[PDB]
Design a protein around this ligand. Structure first.
Ligand SMILES: CCCCCCCCCCCCCCCCCC(=O)OC[C@H](COP(=O)([O-])OCC(O)COP(=O)([O-])OC[C@@H](COC(=O)CCCCCCCCCCCCCCCCC)OC(=O)CCCCCCCCCCCCCCCCC)OC(=O)CCCCCCCCCCCCCCCCC
Ligand SMILES: CCCCCCCCCCCCCCCCCC(=O)OC[C@H](COP(=O)([O-])OCC(O)COP(=O)([O-])OC[C@@H](COC(=O)CCCCCCCCCCCCCCCCC)OC(=O)CCCCCCCCCCCCCCCCC)OC(=O)CCCCCCCCCCCCCCCCC
Ligand SMILES: CCCCCCCCCCCCCCCCCC(=O)OC[C@H](COP(=O)(O)OCCN)OC(=O)CCCCCCCCCCCCC
Ligand SMILES: CCCCCCCCCCCCCC(=O)OC[C@H](COP(=O)([O-])OCC[N+](C)(C)C)OC(=O)CCCCCCCCCCCCC
Ligand code: HEC
Ligand code: HEM
Ligand code: HEM
Ligand code: HEM
Ligand SMILES: CO/C=C(/C(=O)OC)c1ccccc1Oc1cc(Oc2ccccc2C#N)ncn1
Lengths: 67, 241, 49, 378, 61, 75, 54, 54
């Protein structure tokens, strides 16, 4: 209904070199923990590293479009 | 003892050393607190009169105070009663005490927001990132009902459902109420709420730097002036032989 | 023997108006004193503010 | 003859600030004497003006402080001056003490030992001041420190419960800390006058450690203007913190009211106590931590007894200079460790730095002065 | 060339200590207005459109 | 206290002094000043620098070892 | 002096602060009170100098 | 405590609950009166015997 500038520029940060490298390390963890459903390992570490690299790019460009 | 995610630094317009708050964004941010946040969060240390000459006129702030009812009394019969708000009233508390608050929020306690920007590491960078940072739990994390995954919150499990979203309110000046906009405006207002002296200290800070840039070399020159008697003195030793 | 005592040369330290040993120092006394006291007056004007 | 010299009142001011023979070569490290005097006065003025609006009761102690920064005219500038003035106080104290170690000023026994008493009472003053706003760190900082006194054998609990006025940090503890935080700065100022009484008996040391009676200058105008300039730099440093970063040195937890049930995650002191907080947590034993924590400051009273060098100042002692800066960097390590959680590898580093602190002062630095004597053949 | 400005400033204002003080207290009066006026003009310019006095006219009546 | 005229004994020492209103308060401030500051630092840099560098190494290692200790391993 | 328009909360608090600070200012002035006294010594009931009998 | 809502009752709290608070308060209130007894004798001694010449 509305175009939130966050989600639009989020996709611009996701398609960067250092961000995609962190995604596949999480997807490797998403495939690691779902396979053997007998463990207690979680993929929190691989997610926060992805968010750390993504949101650093978001902060540099987001505020140029808002009032 | 969990993993931590620290917030990045957003380029707020009040970040710079001499940079004031944006008072139009303050005005919009108050509307977010009133419409969205005030139903769960108190702000016990801000009163309607503090708005006057910051983001609303006196007449505007009076009309705003009169939109709520507050308790007063006793009257001559010893009874409490309700009257319209005035400029001197503090913002209504949503709950009489924290025990009622926990019961209304699945056992969690929404903190007072008067000082939230100053009471949390990262300030508005943290608050902005929390509100706008919700996402699905990673694989292998299953939170009990009542709690919500938020990677910026300590422990990553927060008892507050996402409170803002597109078109959560309409702004008086027509600004598109996107989630990021709403977060940005409410964070700016909360900075003002926690540090109303923000703009004035920077104005003072500028005058202090200018006066120091004058007075320091002049006072230095006075020091060197007096000391020059000593700094250029010459000694000679003439013992009898 | 005290007639051997010459005063050392302060040319490295003297102000420009006081370099010439054949020109009277009275010609620049008011200007030199005025400058250092203008520094003091401006300093007091700053602290007063 | 001269009114300034013969009047009973002016002769004390004259023989202290005007005609005092002072060395011609004392450097900027001698400015911190007057700056400490200014900080003490500055803390008393702002401290008094805060007491006209602060209330020492738990139900309003937190909000009375809020009332100052919001409603009181220029209350916010008066508070942050007080909070940051305390930090500037401790900057100057540590430069002031370090100047005395490096240059040998501790050989003035009476002046130095009264200085140690001044350091302790200023620390006790700031410790009680931090309790008054009654924030999270105000409460829990008071809890973890006062609980150390229970480790004293056979009178521990009775002493702790007497200082508390109950069974924990509570209403009675908050009120008396305000009274003690009020009385002490005047007791401090009186001891600072005795600090000067013993000093003027001998005059100042100088960077060389050699007597300067052959070359003295009057304190006025040479060091009146030099202390004024130094005081101007002090106001620059203070106002930069007050007007551009008033929350840099403070902890955000203190902006949350006290809560005896909910504990903050990381209980860290102000920066000027981190070195001693690290020494406390590096010792596993409880009573041993208190003794080491008290010995961390009382060791200063032993430096005159551990002076081995035939020379007074470290200016002509390279092997002692290196050990002196090893003490600073080791103290900068304890400061760093103090603001970090008690986990690997900070536990081991904090223990090494703690032993290195007492080893440098008790063993290594005295031994260097003896080696230096042999190299000069005396 | 007549004597420099600093020379006429000395003999006319700074020689007597009483006039030296009258110069300072009068110089303090005009310096305060000129410095506060100019300094505020720098603060508002750097923060154009953000302070309340800029958005004041929108909510007149 | 101690007074001028009662301090110590000095003989055969002459001192020449210039009035401050006849000399510059900043004589060769950058010409001689900057070479003298380089001399003053070079003569003391080897006394002060190593321990603060040793701290900077411990500070850097201990902060690296701290973060990598809590990160998970395949075990 | 009131901090308002009458004796009120602000008047009560500052009076406590002033009632605290003054007795120490008093004690310091009492030391100067003795400084000037010892310059001359005490008077006595007769008003005649007592240097001949101390 | 220097607040109107508890200034009166904090004084009551001393004379009732605090150990030997009542003896400490009345010493303070009556000590002030003894202070003024001594002050007036002290001043009157100075007028009668001429000590004001200092
Ligand atoms: C602001 C933070 C200051 C951090 C401490 C700085 C240390 C210092 O030298 O202070 C200058 C100043 C020099 O005074 P001094 O009496 O002429 O010499 C004191 C010692 O004898 C100094 O001993 P020294 O004779 O061996 O000299 C050491 C050298 C030390 O100099 C350096 O290491 C820095 C060299 C800068 C080179 C330019 C790079 C840009 O200092 C100088 O020679 C003069 C420095 C002038 C500043 C120029 C900066 C540009 O000393 C102080 O003010 C000490 C207190 C400062 C703490 C302030 C914190 C609040
Ligand atoms: C917490 C607050 C702590 C307060 C500390 C109290 C400091 C104090 O009262 O002592 C004053 C004491 C006075 O120094 P001084 O009168 O020049 O005598 C130094 C010796 O004669 C040594 O003479 P020199 O031949 O070695 O002179 C070297 C020259 C320093 O050499 C330079 O000129 C460096 C210039 C760097 C810019 C490069 C552009 C090319 O002057 C200085 O050492 C002063 C350093 C401050 C430079 C200010 C910016 C210029 O040291 C200072 O820290 C003065 C700072 C004054 C700030 C001026 C800003 C305007
Ligand atoms: C107990 C509390 C713990 C708290 C921890 C606080 C963190 C510490 C942060 C470190 C800041 C360091 C300050 C800057 C040091 C500059 C030193 C310098 O410029 O060079 C060496 C100088 C040489 O000068 P000389 O007099 O020997 O000869 C001069 C002839 N041109 O020699 C000197 O000028 C040295 C004079 C002494 C300076 C004192 C600084 C140390 C402060 C802490 C000491 C605490 C002791 C218990
Ligand atoms: C109730 C209302 C009352 C309001 C009254 C307002 C009055 C304002 C001030 C005016 C008085 C000036 C007096 C004066 O001018 O005589 C002081 C002295 C003279 O100067 P001079 O030696 O050139 O001799 C002068 C020689 N002639 C005269 C031949 C040129 O001035 C100096 O020397 C000292 C100047 C240095 C300033 C810094 C001192 C402040 C303390 C430290 C601040 C920082 C930390 C707290
Ligand atoms: C009820 C429907 C709420 C609404 C509307 C808002 N908040 Fe909230 N908040 C709520 C709860 C139950 C909690 C406690 C969470 C917990 O697990 O303790 C909170 C907490 C916060 C916090 C504190 C986060 C922290 O670091 O401790 C903040 C900063 C916060 N909430 C912000 C906030 C804002 C800006 C809101 C309006 C946009 C808002 N909340 C609304 C419940 C509710
Ligand atoms: C409120 C606290 C203090 C104040 C206000 C104060 C003030 C002063 C002043 C004004 C001087 C003379 C000027 C100077 O040397 O800079 C001085 C000298 C001195 N002080 Fe302090 N001081 C305090 C605490 C201390 C402490 C904590 C110590 C050491 C433990 C100490 C030790 C000394 C010594 C040894 C001297 C003589 C220095 C010399 O002559 O070179 N003082 N102090
Ligand atoms: C050596 C002198 C002093 C030191 C080092 C000192 C230090 C401190 C510090 C660090 C605080 C904490 C402030 C904060 O965190 O907000 C504080 C609080 C306080 N102090 Fe002091 N102080 C001194 C003198 C005084 C004096 C003399 C008074 C009273 C006349 C006073 C009154 C207060 C009050 C009322 C508070 C609570 C208000 C507040 O927290 O800002 N102080 N003090
Ligand atoms: C806190 C208030 C005061 C204290 C603690 C104090 C204390 C003293 C002391 C100990 C003496 C010497 C012993 C004696 O003469 O009894 C003295 C003498 C004296 N005082 Fe006070 N005094 C105070 C106030 C006053 C006042 C209000 C006056 C008069 C207006 C005054 C006038 C004198 C005089 C004239 C003397 C010399 C008496 C003599 O030598 O015969 N003093 N005071
Ligand atoms: C009331 O707590 C105050 C604190 C503070 O830093 O005040 C300035 C504090 C806060 C959190 C934790 C502890 C705190 O207090 C302290 C107090 C403290 O006092 C000492 C300082 C030096 C040497 C010994 C001691 C002791 N005991 N050493 C360390 N922390």
């Amino acid at each position: 209904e509305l175009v939130d500038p966050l989600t639009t520029v989020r996709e611009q940060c996701e398609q960067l070199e250092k961000c995609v490298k962190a995604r596949e390390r999480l997807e490797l963890c998403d495939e690691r923990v779902s396979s053997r459903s007998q463990t207690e390992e979680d993929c929190t570490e691989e997610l926060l590293d992805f968010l750390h690299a993504r949101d650093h790019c978001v902060a540099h460009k987001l505020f140029n479009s808002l009032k | 003892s969990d993993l931590e995610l620290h917030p990045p630094s957003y380029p707020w317009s009040h970040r710079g050393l001499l940079s004031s708050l944006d008072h139009t964004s303050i005005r919009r941010g108050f509307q977010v607190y009133k419409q969205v946040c005030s139903s769960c969060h108190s702000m016990d240390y801000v009163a309607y009169r503090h708005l006057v000459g910051v983001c609303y006129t006196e007449d505007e702030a009076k009309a705003l105070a009169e939109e709520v009812e507050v308790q007063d009394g006793p009257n001559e019969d010893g009874e409490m009663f309700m009257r319209p708000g005035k400029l001197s009233d503090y913002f209504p508390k949503p709950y009489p005490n924290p025990e009622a608050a926990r019961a209304a929020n699945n056992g969690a306690l929404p903190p007072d927001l008067s000082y939230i920007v100053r009471a949390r590491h990262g300030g508005e960078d943290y608050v902005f990132s929390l509100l706008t940072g919700y996402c699905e739990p990673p694989t292998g994390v299953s939170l009990r009902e009542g709690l919500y995954f938020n990677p910026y919150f300590p422990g990553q499990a927060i008892g507050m459902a996402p409170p803002i979203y597109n078109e959560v309110l309409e702004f008086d000046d027509g600004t598109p109420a996107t989630m990021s906009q709403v977060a940005k405006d409410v964070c700016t207002f909360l900075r003002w709420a926690a540090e109303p002296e923000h703009d004035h200290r920077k104005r003072m800070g500028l005058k202090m730097l200018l006066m120091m840039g004058l007075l320091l070399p002049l006072v230095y020159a006075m020091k060197r002036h007096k000391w020059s008697v000593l700094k250029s003195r010459k000694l000679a030793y003439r013992p009898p032989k | 023997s005290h007639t051997d005592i010459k005063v050392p040369d302060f040319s490295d330290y003297r102000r420009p108006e006081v370099l010439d040993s054949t020109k009277s120092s009275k010609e620049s006394s008011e200007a030199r004193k005025g400058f250092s006291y203008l520094v003091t007056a401006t300093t007091t004007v700053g602290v007063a503010y | 003859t001269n009114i300034r010299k013969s009047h009973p009142l002016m002769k004390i001011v004259n023989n202290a600030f005007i005609d005092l023979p002072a060395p011609s070569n004392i450097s900027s490290w001698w400015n911190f004497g007057s700056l400490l005097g200014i900080c003490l006065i500055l803390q008393i003025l702002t401290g008094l003006f805060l007491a006209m609006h602060y209330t020492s009761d738990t139900t309003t102690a937190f909000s009375s402080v809020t009332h100052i920064c919001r409603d009181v005219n220029y209350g916010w500038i008066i508070r942050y001056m007080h909070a940051n003035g305390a930090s500037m106080f401790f900057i100057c104290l540590y430069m002031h003490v370090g100047r005395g170690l490096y240059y040998g000023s501790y050989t003035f026994l009476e002046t130095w030992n009264i200085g140690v008493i001044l350091l302790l009472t200023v620390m006790a003053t700031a410790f009680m001041g931090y309790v008054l706003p009654w924030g999270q760190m105000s409460f829990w900082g008071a809890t973890v420190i006062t609980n150390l006194l229970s480790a004293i054998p056979y009178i521990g609990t009775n002493l702790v419960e007497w200082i508390w006025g109950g069974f924990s940090v509570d209403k009675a503890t908050l009120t008396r800390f305000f009274a003690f935080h009020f009385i002490l700065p005047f007791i401090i100022m009186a001891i600072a006058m005795v600090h000067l009484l013993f000093l003027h008996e001998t005059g100042s040391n100088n960077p060389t450690g050699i007597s300067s009676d052959v070359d003295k200058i009057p304190f006025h105008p040479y060091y009146t203007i030099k202390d004024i300039l130094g005081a101007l730099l002090l106001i620059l440093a203070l106002m930069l913190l007050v007007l551009f970063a008033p929350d840099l040195l403070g902890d955000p937890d203190n902006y949350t009211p006290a809560n005896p049930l909910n504990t903050p995650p990381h209980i860290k002191p102000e920066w000027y106590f981190l070195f001693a907080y690290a020494i406390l947590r590096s010792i596993p034993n409880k009573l041993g931590g208190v003794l080491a924590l008290a010995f961390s400051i009382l060791i200063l009273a032993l430096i005159p007894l551990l002076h081995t060098s035939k020379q007074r100042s470290m200016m002509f002692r390279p092997l002692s200079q290196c050990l002196f800066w090893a003490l600073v960097a080791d103290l900068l390590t304890l400061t760093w460790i103090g603001g970090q959680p008690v986990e690997h590898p900070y536990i081991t580093i904090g223990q090494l730095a703690s032993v290195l602190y007492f080893l440098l002062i008790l063993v290594l630095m005295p031994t260097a002065g003896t080696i230096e004597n042999k190299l000069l053949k005396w | 060339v007549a004597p420099t400005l600093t020379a006429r400033l000395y003999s006319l204002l700074f020689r007597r200590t009483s006039t030296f003080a009258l110069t300072i207290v009068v110089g303090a009066l005009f310096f305060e207005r000129a410095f506060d006026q100019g300094a505020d003009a720098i603060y508002e310019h750097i923060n154009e459109g953000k302070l309340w006095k800029h958005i004041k006219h929108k909510y007149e009546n | 206290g101690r007074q001028f005229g009662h301090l110590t004994r000095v003989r055969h020492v002459i001192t020449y002094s210039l009035s401050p209103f006849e000399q510059r308060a900043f004589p060769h401030y950058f010409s001689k000043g900057i070479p003298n500051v380089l001399r003053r630092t070079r003569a003391c840099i080897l006394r002060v620098a190593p321990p603060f560098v040793a701290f900077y190494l411990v500070y850097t290692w201990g902060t690296q070892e701290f973060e990598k200790s809590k990160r998970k391993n395949p075990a």
